[PDB]
Design a protein around this ligand. Structure first.
Ligand SMILES: CC1=C(CCOP(=O)(O)OP(=O)(O)O)S/C(=C(/O)CO)N1Cc1cnc(C)nc1N
Ligand SMILES: CC1=C(CCOP(=O)(O)OP(=O)(O)O)S/C(=C(/O)CO)N1Cc1cnc(C)nc1N
Ligand SMILES: [Ca+2]
Ligand SMILES: [Ca+2]
Lengths: 678, 678
C-alpha cells in the first residue's frame, strides 16, 4: 500500500538522477527515469543496512544495466549510504566517488558493471554463494543466511551471450532467491529493439526453468511492481524474471526515444520535467525532508535493527556451535586458517616427474578440507582439468540427486564467460569465498569480458587453466594457446602463473589463495615435468628467482613452466661446450614485478645477455630479456613431442640459440631490460 | 526412400571414422558414430560439386561440433573430394591434411571449428551472405543464388553464449535457408547433460523465431531425417533446428557413455562393432565398391552437372546483364575494382582536425558505392561507431519494414562475439564479401573467441573499433582499453591499425580491404586530431614510417594514433631546448613487421635512443623501443583532457621523459630493438 509520500519519493529519485547527469553534461538519463518506480518499490522492501554495506546477510542489489548508475547513486544517497549530494555533483569527474559506471569499490555497489551482461551473471554467483552459505551454516533456530539477490537489467544484457549462459545455469540450479527485473522499454542505442531483438524473452526464460512475471505499467504501477516481487519470493524453486514495461526517459519531452538513452536532457526539458512533477524548475539536487524521513523510517532504521538482530543471533550461534561459529567468524574476518599453507604439497629433485595439471589436482585434494570457503568447478572439463577432489559433493539443487546446495563443486557446463562472472559474484558475496574454475587455457579467452572485471574490481578469483600450449598435441591450433599469456600479462592487476614443477605449483596456489584483491590464472601442462633442483615454494612465491645459479654466467636463460626444465637441460648442453648458463624461473610476471627493484635486478642483472624461453608469443618478453625464443605463429595438430621439435624446442635447440645470442653480444655492454629511464 | 545400399553407406561411414580415430590413437569416436546416419542423408541431398569445392552456389555444410571431424573427413573422402584414405590414415599427425579439428584451408571444410559455438555462428553469416547475394544478383529466369546452409552441432555449441547471440539474430532475420541439426545425445564431457544443461532447447529456439522439428530415432530413422530436412526447406521464413536424438558412440560396447566422447575405442570394441555391421573385424579403412559407386551416382555426378548448368546460366547472365554480370564475375575472381583506392580520401596539413572515428565514416561513405561487396554493421553502436553510410539500406527480412535482403548494413544488436563469427561466415561464403563490424575497442575483447579464428583461418574481416583509449573520458575504466592492442598484437596474423590522422585512416582501410588472408582491427579515436605534416597513404601503408625526420636526432619518438600528434608537439618542446627528435608513426605492427628488415631498420636504426608513446599497455613495445611511455594500470572516469593530463600525456610530459631517456643512455652504444640474434 503506497501513498503520496511514495509518489513524491519516485519524483525525487527521477529528478535527482536527471540533475546528476545534467551537471556532468555526460551520462544516461533514460533508464534512471524509466526504472525509478521499480527502484523505490524494490529498495523499500529490501532488508539491508545503509550504515553497514558489508552485513553478510543483506539482500543484495545489482545494476546490470550499469549505464543507469545515476539511479543507483541517487538511491544510495537517498536511503542513507555514505554518499552525499556533493558526491552526485561530482558525477563522472576525475577522482570523484561517482564514476560514469558503478565500481565495486564504492560501498553499496556490489560489483563493477558497465560491460553489459556481467551484472546479471554476477548475481547468479551471489545467489549460488547464498545458497551454499545457508546450506553450510544454517541450523534449527539459527537462520544465519536467507538473503535475496535482486538485479536490474535491460535489453542490452539480455542480448549478450554471457547472460544466456548464466541464466541457463541459474535455471538448472533452481535459484529461487534470485529475482531479476527486466526494463522492457523497447529501445537500445540503434533505435527500436525490433530492428535486431524481437525474440520472445519470456518464453526463453521459461525454457531455462525461470518463472516469468509481468508488470504492464512499470511507469506508475507501484502496487503491481510490489506484487510481482512478492510473488517471486513464493517460487523458492525457480529464479524469477519480472518483465516490467516502461517508457525510457519517462517524463522527458523525448521519452520513448533512443535519444534519451545516453545524453543529458536539455535544460528546458529538465525544467518542464520538474514542473510536471511539482518541483521548482529553477532548483537542482533537491531532496524534500519528507523523503529523507520516509527512508529513515522504512529502510535505514529497520535495516539497522535487522543487522542488530542478526548480530545477536550469530553471537548465540557461536556459543551453540563453537566450531562452525568460529569457522564462519574467521571467514567473515576475511582470513584463511592460521598456517593453512602447511598443508601445501612440497617436493624435492628426488620425487618423480608429474604434469603440473596433476600436481594442481593434488594441491586441491590436500587443501579442500582445510579451506571450507574453497568452491571449485569446471566448464565441462572436470576429467581434463582435474579440478574435482575425490569425495567432493557437487553444488546442485536438492531435487537433482547429484548433490545439494552444501556441495562445493560446480558443473558450469560449456560456459566459460558465465563461469568467469559467476566466480566474480561468488567472490563478491563475501564470507571469504574462494571460487576457482577450470577450463583449457585457450578458452579462458572466451571469458575475457569477465576476467577484465576480476582484475579491475579486484576479485581474487582463480582460473585453473590446463593444456597451456602446443603440448596439447593432436587437438591442434584451435586448442593451442599462443597469445593467451601475453594478453593477460598486459592486463593490469592479474597474476598469470605458469608453474614449472611441484613446488612452483604450490607457490602459485599459495599466492593465489592468500590474494585479497588480485585474480589469478594458473597455466598448467598435461605433459610430465621433473621436480627441479633448486625450486621451492618460498622462492617461487616471489614470482621470479634464480633456479640454477653459476658464477659469472655467459648467459641467463629465463623461462616459465615446461620450458624451465628444457632450459636446465639446455644448460647441460652448454656446459659440455664450456659455456656457463644461469637458469631463471619466472612463474609469474605480476608477482615478480611486485618485488623490490633490488631483488629483481639480482635475478636479471646487467652485464650478461638474457634470452627467454617459452613456447608462446614473445611479444611480452621485452621487459625481461634481450632476445626471445618462443612461438609467434599458430600451432599444429600432431603428437606433442613432434610438435615441440617442429618448433625447435629441444635442449639442443635452446642451447644453439643461446650460443647465437652470446656471439651476437660479444664485446657489448649489456644493461638489464629491467632498468627504466623514468 | 532409402535402401540397403544406404544402410551399407552408413555402416561404412561409422567404421571409417572409427578406424581413423583408432589409428591416430587420439580423437573423438562418439559423435561421428552418432551422427553418421544424418551425415549420409544430409550429404546425399546436398547440391555440391566435390570436384569444385569453391562453386559459389553450392549448398554448404558446417560441423560446429568440430571434435567430430573424423565424420567430416570420412564424408569428404567417400563422396569424391580430394582427400584419400592415406590422408585419413594420417589423422592428427604433424603436417597431415587431416588435423584434429577442421581447418578452413582444406577443400570441403567451410570454416575452422573446434572452439564450440563458432560453427553455428559462422553458418548464420553464410546464410546472410547467400540471402544478400540472391537479393542483389538474381533476376527473372536467372536464379544464380539459392543454396542452403546446413549445420551440425551438439550440446556444447548450444551452451556457449555465442550461439545464443547468433541464433537470436538468425531468428530475427528469418533465415529460412539455414538448417541446423542438433545431435541430442544427452552427453557432454562431464557426463549426463542433466547435471548442468536441462533447459528446453526447443522452446528457446522457438522463442528466437526458429522452427523446431524432431527426429526421435536419429540412430536409424533415415526417412525421418530426410523428412525433417524436406520440411525445413518449406519454412522459407524461419531458420530451422532439427532436434535429432541419438546415442553417442552408437555401435560401441560403451555407446551412451561419456567415455566414448573423446578417446579411441579399444581394439576389441572396434572388432565387435565391425562384426555387428557385417564387416570383417580384421580389416580397416574398408570402402565397399558399391559405396563409391552409390555416391558417384547420387552426389558427385549430379553435383558436377548442377555446377555445369550453373556455369551455363551464369555465362548467359553475363550476356543479358553486362554490368551486373561483370560485377559478379569480378567478385568471384576475388579482386577489388581496378584502381578502387582512387576513391579513398586524402588530406594535407592544411585540412582541419578530425577524429579518426569521423574520418573512418568518411572513408566508408566514399567507397561503399565503389565496393558492392562491402557489408557493414555495428553491435548496437551505429551512432557511436559512425559505421553506417548516409543512404544505406539495412539488411533485414522483407517483412521488417526497415529494409530487405539486398540491404548492406547489419544491425547486430549487443552481440560482439556473434558479430565476429558471423563476419567470418560472410567472409567465408566467398564472392569477395567484405564484412566490417563496429563496436568499442574495449568490447572487441568480448569476441576474442571468434577473432582468434579470423586470424587462424585467415578471414580478412574488419573491426571498426572506436573509442580506443582513456580518450573515452567519462564512461570510465570499464570502457577504456589498456591491454586490448597488446593482446591482438600478440595474436599471429592480425592487423592492429591505430591511424593517427586522415591519410593514415585511408591507408588502414586500403590495406585492410585489399587483404586476402589477414583480418584487421582498426582502432579509432573520438577526440579531434590534426592532419599531420608528413603523413601519406603510401607511407602509412607500410605500417611504420618516419613522419617527421631530422638529421642526427638525439632521440626517436615512436608513437601511434592520437599520440603521434602529441609526439610532434613534444618535438617542438624539445627543439626549444636544442634537442632533436625524429618522429616515427607506427600505424600497424603487423604491416610494419612485413616490410624488409632493411626498411624497418631505416625507420628504427641503431645508435639512437627510441622511446615509444601510446596511452595503453607498454608490454608489447619491447620489440621497437628501448623505453616506453604508456599506461599499465586501469583508466579513470573524467573529462578526457583531464584524464590525459592525469596520466602525464601532454607535450611537456612526453618531452620530459624523452630528456630522461637521453640522459639515461648518454655515452652508451645503442642497438635497434629490431636486431635479433637468431
Ligand atoms: C550497446 C550499449 C548499450 C545498450 C543500451 O541498451 P540497454 O537496453 O541495455 O538500455 P537502455 O534501455 O538504457 O538504452 S549501453 C552501452 C554502453 O556503453 C553504456 O554503458 N553500450 C555499449 C556496450 C557494448 N558492449 C558491451 C559488452 N557493453 C557495453 N556497455
Ligand atoms: C567442453 C568440450 C566439449 C564438449 C562436448 O560436448 P558436445 O555435446 O558438444 O558433444 P559430444 O556429444 O560429442 O560429447 S568437446 C571439447 C573439446 O575440446 C573438443 O573439441 N570441449 C572443450 C572446449 C571448451 N570450450 C570451448 C569454447 N571449446 C571447446 N572445444
Ligand atoms: Ca532497452
Ligand atoms: Ca551432444
Amino acid at each position: 500500500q503506497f501513498t503520496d509520500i511514495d509518489k513524491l519519493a519516485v519524483s525525487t529519485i527521477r529528478i535527482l538522477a536527471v540533475d546528476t547527469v545534467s551537471k556532468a553534461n555526460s551520462g544516461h538519463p533514460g533508464a534512471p527515469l524509466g526504472m525509478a518506480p521499480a527502484a523505490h518499490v524494490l529498495w523499500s522492501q529490501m532488508r539491508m543496512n545503509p550504515t553497514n554495506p558489508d552485513w553478510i546477510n543483506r539482500d543484495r542489489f545489482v545494476l546490470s544495466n550499469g549505464h543507469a548508475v545515476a539511479l543507483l547513486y541517487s538511491m544510495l544517497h537517498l536511503t542513507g549510504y555514505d554518499l552525499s549530494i556533493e558526491d552526485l555533483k561530482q558525477f563522472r569527474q576525475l577522482g570523484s566517488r561517482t564514476p560514469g559506471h558503478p565500481e565495486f569499490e564504492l560501498p553499496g555497489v556490489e560489483v563493477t558493471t558497465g560491460p553489459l551482461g556481467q551484472g546479471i551473471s554476477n548475481a547468479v554467483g551471489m545467489a549460488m554463494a547464498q545458497a551454499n552459505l545457508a546450506a553450510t551454516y544454517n541450523k534449527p533456530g539459527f537462520t544465519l543466511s536467507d538473503n535475496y539477490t535482486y538485479v536490474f537489467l535491460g535489453d542490452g544484457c539480455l542480448q549478450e551471450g554471457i547472460s544466456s549462459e548464466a541464466s541457463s545455469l541459474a535455471g538448472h540450479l533452481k535459484l529461487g532467491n534470485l529475482i531479476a527485473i527486466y526494463d522492457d522499454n523497447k529501445i537500445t542505442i540503434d533505435g527500436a529493439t525490433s530492428i535486431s531483438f524481437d525474440e520472445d524473452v519470456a518464453k526463453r526464460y521459461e525454457a531455462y526453468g525461470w518463472e516469468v512475471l509481468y508488470v504492464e505499467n512499470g511507469n506508475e504501477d507501484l502496487a503491481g511492481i510490489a506484487k510481482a516481487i512478492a510473488q517471486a519470493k513464493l517460487s523458492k524453486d525457480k529464479p524469477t524474471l519480472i518483465k516490467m514495461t516502461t517508457t525510457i526517459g519517462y517524463g522527458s519531452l523525448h521519452a520513448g526515444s533512443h535519444s534519451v538513452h545516453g545524453a543529458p536532457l536539455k535544460a528546458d526539458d529538465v525544467k518542464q520535467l520538474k514542473s510536471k512533477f511539482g518541483f521548482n524548475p529553477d532548483k537542482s539536487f533537491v531532496v524534500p525532508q519528507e523523503v529523507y524521513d520516509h527512508y529513515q523510517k522504512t529502510i535505514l532504521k529497520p535495516g539497522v535493527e535487522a543487522n542488530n538482530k542478526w548480530n545477536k543471533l550469530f553471537s548465540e550461534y557461536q556459543k551453540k556451535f563453537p566450531e562452525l561459529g568460529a569457522e564462519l567468524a574467521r571467514r567473515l574476518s576475511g582470513q584463511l586458517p592460521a598456517n593453512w599453507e602447511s598443508k601445501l604439497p612440497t617436493y624435492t629433485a628426488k620425487d618423480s616427474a608429474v604434469a603440473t595439471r596433476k600436481l594442481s589436482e593434488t594441491v586441491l585434494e590436500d587443501v579442500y578440507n582445510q579451506l571450507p570457503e574453497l568452491i571449485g568447478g569446471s566448464a565441462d572439463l572436470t576429467p581434463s582439468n582435474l579440478t574435482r577432489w575425490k569425495e567432493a559433493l557437487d553444488f546442485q539443487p536438492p531435487s537433482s540427486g547429484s548433490g545439494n546446495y552444501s556441495g562445493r563443486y560446480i558443473r558450469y557446463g560449456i560456459r566459460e564467460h558465465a563461469m568467469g562472472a559467476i566466480m566474480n559474484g561468488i567472490s563478491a558475496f563475501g564470507a571469504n569465498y574462494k571460487p576457482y574454475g577450470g577450463t583449457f587455457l585457450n578458452f579462458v579467452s572466451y571469458a575475457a569480458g569477465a576476467v577484465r572485471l576480476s582484475a579491475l574490481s579486484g576479485h581474487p578469483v582463480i582460473w585453473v587453466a590446463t593444456h597451456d600450449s602446443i603440448g596439447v598435441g593432436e587437438d591442434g591450433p584451435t586448442h593451442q594457446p599462443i597469445e593467451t599469456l601475453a594478453h593477460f600479462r598486459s592486463l593490469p592487476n592479474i597474476q598469470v602463473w605458469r608453474p614449472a614443477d611441484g613446488n612452483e605449483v604450490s607457490a602459485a596456489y599459495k599466492n593465489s589463495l592468500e590474494s585479497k584483491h588480485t585474480p589469478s590464472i594458473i597455466a598448467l601442462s598435461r605433459q610430465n615435468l621433473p621436480q627441479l633442483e633448486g625450486s621451492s615454494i618460498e622462492s617461487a612465491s616471489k614470482g621470479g628467482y634464480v633456479l640454477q645459479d653459476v658464477a659469472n654466467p655467459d648467459i641467463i636463460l629465463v623461462a616459465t613452466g615446461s620450458e624451465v626444465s628444457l632450459s636446465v637441460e639446455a644448460a647441460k648442453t652448454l656446459a659440455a661446450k664450456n659455456i656457463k648458463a644461469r637458469v631463471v624461473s619466472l612463474p609469474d610476471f605480476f608477482t615478480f614485478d611486485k618485488q623490490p627493484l633490488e631483488y629483481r635486478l639480482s635475478v636479471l642483472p646487467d652485464n650478461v645477455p638474457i634470452m627467454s624461453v617459452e613456447v608462446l608469443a614473445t611479444t611480452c618478453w621485452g621487459k625481461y630479456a634481450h632476445q626471445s625464443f618462443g612461438i609467434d605463429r599458430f600451432g599444429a595438430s600432431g603428437k606433442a613431442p613432434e610438435v615441440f621439435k617442429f618448433f625447435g624446442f629441444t635442449p639442443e635447440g635452446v642451447a644453439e640459440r643461446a650460443q647465437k645470442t652470446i656471439a651476437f653480444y660479444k664485446g657489448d655492454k649489456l644493461i638489464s631490460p629491467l632498468k627504466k629511464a623514468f
